[PDB]
């Protein structure tokens, strides 16, 4: 869910990247 | 008590089942199976005792888990209180520790609302 930083959707929501959402 | 001290649920995949252990999130699950060479998608019911002990042996020796981890977490909080920093003081009264507001909310730390009389109005 959007409040879960440990996910793609979550990093998108917070507008950030990382292991769980790469660029 | 199969592994580590807990019985991970059969009829689910290993990678998920390992998570039910205190100290294993999904990330350590993927890595442990890779490092020991077992399919992440195989139901716990369907593991050779060879797979079982190999997976078991790895997991317990690689990371500190369950009780030991809880104890180590407990010692840390205990340390903060005894010194005792502002962080330690917060643990004493069971308030948030990471700078959240307490005028509202904070229910997870504070618990259920203990309602109290307010201030009456004139007539």
């Amino acid at each position: 869910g959007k409040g879960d930083r440990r996910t793609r959707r979550g990093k998108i929501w917070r507008g950030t990247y990382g292991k769980y959402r790469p660029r | 008590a199969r592994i580590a001290g807990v019985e991970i649920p059969r009829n689910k995949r290993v990678d998920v089942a390992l998570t039910y252990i205190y100290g294993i999130g999904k990330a350590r699950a993927k890595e442990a199976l890779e490092k020991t060479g077992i399919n992440p998608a195989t139901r716990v019911k369907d593991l050779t005792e060879a797979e079982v002990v190999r997976l078991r042996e790895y997991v317990e020796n690689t990371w500190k888990l369950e009780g030991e981890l809880r104890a180590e977490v407990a010692a840390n909080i205990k340390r903060l209180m005894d010194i005792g920093c502002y962080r330690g003081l917060r643990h004493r009264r069971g308030l948030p520790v990471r700078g959240q507001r307490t005028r509202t909310n904070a229910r997870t730390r504070k618990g259920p609302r203990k309602t109290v009389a307010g201030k009456k109005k004139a007539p």
Binding site: - | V53, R56, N61, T62, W63, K64, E68, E72, A75
Partner: protein, 69 residues
């Protein structure tokens, strides 16, 4: 012993994950176990597992003495 009410104890072999094998007596002929005396951390030497830490803290911190003199 009283007839009829007790379960038979028979020669039995208990097997651990560490390959340990125990020759004893039980109600079950063969039994497989996750741990035993031979491989349990507390029993075996002091096999301190993952935690060598003690604990570490606080001034193993070091890193370093860089702030000047």
């Amino acid at each position: 012993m009283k007839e009829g009410i007790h379960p038979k104890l028979v020669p039995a072999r208990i097997i651990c994950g560490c390959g340990n094998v125990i020759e004893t007596y039980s109600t079950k002929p063969e039994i497989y176990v996750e741990v035993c005396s031979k491989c349990h951390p507390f029993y075996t030497g002091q096999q301190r597992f993952v935690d060598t830490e003690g604990r570490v803290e606080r001034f193993q911190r070091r890193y370093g003495d860089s702030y000047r003199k």
